[PDB]
Structures are given as C-alpha cells and as structure tokens.
C-alpha cells in the first residue's frame, strides 16, 4: 500500500511558480509506481456448521446414491498382491467405467497401493468419508464391514 | 514496374516533398533535367533514387529506357532524433531532427 512502497517521504518538487498540480508524494495512488488502494490482504476463508447439520448432510448424500442404485456393496475386498492389473480386472468385472470411490473397514495396504495409480479411483477408510468425495465420484463401492461400522457411527 | 526506396535519409519531410511535387508524372529524361537545375538539398538524393530505379528496371526486368514515366513517387516520415538546446534563465528547449523515406516507382507508358 501507500506506506510500504520504497521511497517517498518528501514533496516531489516544490512545483510552484508555474502552476502545476499540488503533488504531495511520488508514491500516491495515482502516480505511475505508487501504492495500491485496498486490494488483497492475507486472511483465511473458513467457518463451521452445527454438528446436526453435518450429520444430516452426510446422511442425505449417502441416501441419494441408494435412491438411484449407485451403491454397490460387496462381501469383502481382498488382494493378495499389490498389482494394478488385478485392480483393473476387478473393476472391469463389475460395471464400473467412470470414477469410483472405494470404502473399506479399517485400512488395507494392498488395496490402497494397487488402485492408487488409476486416474479415477480413490480409496478412503470408513472414518474418512465426507460429502464432497461421495458427491464427486459416480459409483461407490463399500465393504460390508464398512457398512456396519458406518451404521454404528451414525 | 520497378521500385526504388531509400530509408532514413537525414532530411526532414515537408522539404523533400516540395521537390517531389515537381517531378511527379513526368518523363524520365525531363525529370532528371529538372532535378539537375533546382538548387535544393533534396535534389541530389532524389536524383540518385531515380537513377537506381532506372537501373533496376533496365537490368532485372529487362525494360527499356526513353519510354519510362514516373508512375508513383512519395515521401514518408521515419524515426526522429530528439536533442536539447539550452536557453536563457536556465531553461531547456527540444529540437526534432527528423528523417524520411523516399519511394519512386517507374513504369512503361
């Protein structure tokens, strides 16, 4: 702003005897390299909602998928080896061609490391579910144990 | 048609135009004779440009002399040099040393 630009501090010139405009500083906002009026300043954009609102939101986004049978629940997910080819074969076995969200109980390293590189697949635990993630991806695959744990939490 | 152009000759416009107004649309020999008889600064430059155009027409495109006429001729302005002259009571004044481009295009009548 006006008081942080290097320089200034004195009248530019006396500017008297010929009748020029009464300049006060060479860093005024209207000069060529002067300060900036208002403009951006560091701050943080973040607020919070009541807890019941968050619970209702997550319930609604979960039920919306069930409304149009976009939720596929399977007995269990198990990969002996962390191979992306195996994960691609599993996805192709089902009718999953767009971005999909994998939900598993606790945390499985093999599945997380096998589906990591596929462009549209994201892996989260039952504790890490959220509205934006589930509302973004199209098809949600969830382990039955994860279903039970999510039911218990809410 | 044959063209000859001189770029940034140290001569101000509005002074070369006076001479160029005399030789526009006339025959080549008459134009050269006119240019040889007027005591002004731009005449030697314009004569050289005209003769260069004549030589280009004769050599490159295989045209004929004694049959050419000055179809096009004009003077444009170019880059300007700015200088300063001191004046009384500690003041300054600006001086513009101007430059011009000269173009001549001859053709068979």
């Amino acid at each position: 702003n006006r008081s942080e630009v290097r320089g200034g501090g004195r009248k530019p010139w006396r500017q008297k005897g010929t009748g020029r405009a009464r300049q006060g500083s060479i860093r005024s906002p209207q000069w060529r390299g002067g300060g900036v009026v208002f403009g951006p300043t560091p701050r943080s954009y973040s607020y919070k909602l009541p807890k019941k609102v968050r619970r209702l939101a997550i319930k609604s986004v979960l039920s919306s998928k069930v409304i149009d049978n976009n939720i596929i629940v399977l007995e269990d997910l198990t990969l002996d080896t962390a191979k992306t080819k195996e994960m691609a074969a599993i996805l192709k076995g089902l009718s999953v061609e767009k971005k999909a969200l994998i939900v598993t109980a606790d945390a499985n390293e093999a599945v997380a490391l096998s589906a990591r590189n596929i462009p549209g697949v994201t892996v989260v635990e039952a504790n890490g579910i959220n509205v934006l993630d589930v509302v973004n991806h199209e098809k949600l695959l969830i382990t039955k144990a994860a279903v039970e744990k999510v039911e218990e939490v809410l | 048609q044959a063209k000859a152009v001189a770029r940034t000759v140290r001569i101000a416009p509005r002074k070369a135009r006076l001479v160029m107004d005399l030789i526009r649309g006339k025959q080549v020999g008459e134009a050269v004779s006119i240019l040889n008889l007027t005591p002004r600064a731009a005449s030697p430059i314009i004569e050289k440009v005209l003769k260069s155009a004549i030589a280009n027409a004769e050599h490159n495109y295989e045209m004929d002399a004694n049959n050419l006429v000055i179809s096009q001729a004009f003077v444009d302005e170019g880059p300007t040099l700015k200088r300063f002259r001191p004046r009384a009571m500690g003041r300054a004044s600006q001086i513009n040393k101007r430059t011009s481009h000269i173009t001549i295009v001859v053709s068979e009548k």
């Binding site: - | 107004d21 005399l22 004779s33 006119i34 040889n36 008889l37």
Partner: protein, 54 residues
C-alpha cells in the same frame, strides 16, 4: 501574444496554398551538353549553345 486556439487541418492546408516551387528555365543542350539553363553554360563543358567555355 499567444494563439487563442489551435488551427484545424483545413486552415493549415489552405494557408500552404502558395508555398511551392517553380519549374526552371529549360533550353537546348550546348555542344551536345546536358540540357543547360537559359543564359548560362552547359553542364558538360560550360558551352553556350555550342560555344564551350571554362
């Protein structure tokens, strides 16, 4: 006195009406000279209608 207002292009162009040059006096080449001036010498050899001088 300083000008009260600027002058338009039309007035300037109309003022420059009489500011032009004149076509010189054209005569014969003296002693096969090059198209000399009236009452003067040939450009080639300073000739007076064939009467060379200087």
């Amino acid at each position: 006195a300083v000008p009260f207002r600027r002058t338009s292009k039309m007035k300037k162009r109309l003022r420059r009406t009489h500011f032009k040059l004149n076509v010189p006096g054209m005569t014969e080449c003296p002693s096969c000279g090059e198209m000399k001036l009236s009452h003067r010498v040939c450009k080639a050899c300073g000739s007076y209608n064939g009467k060379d001088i200087n």
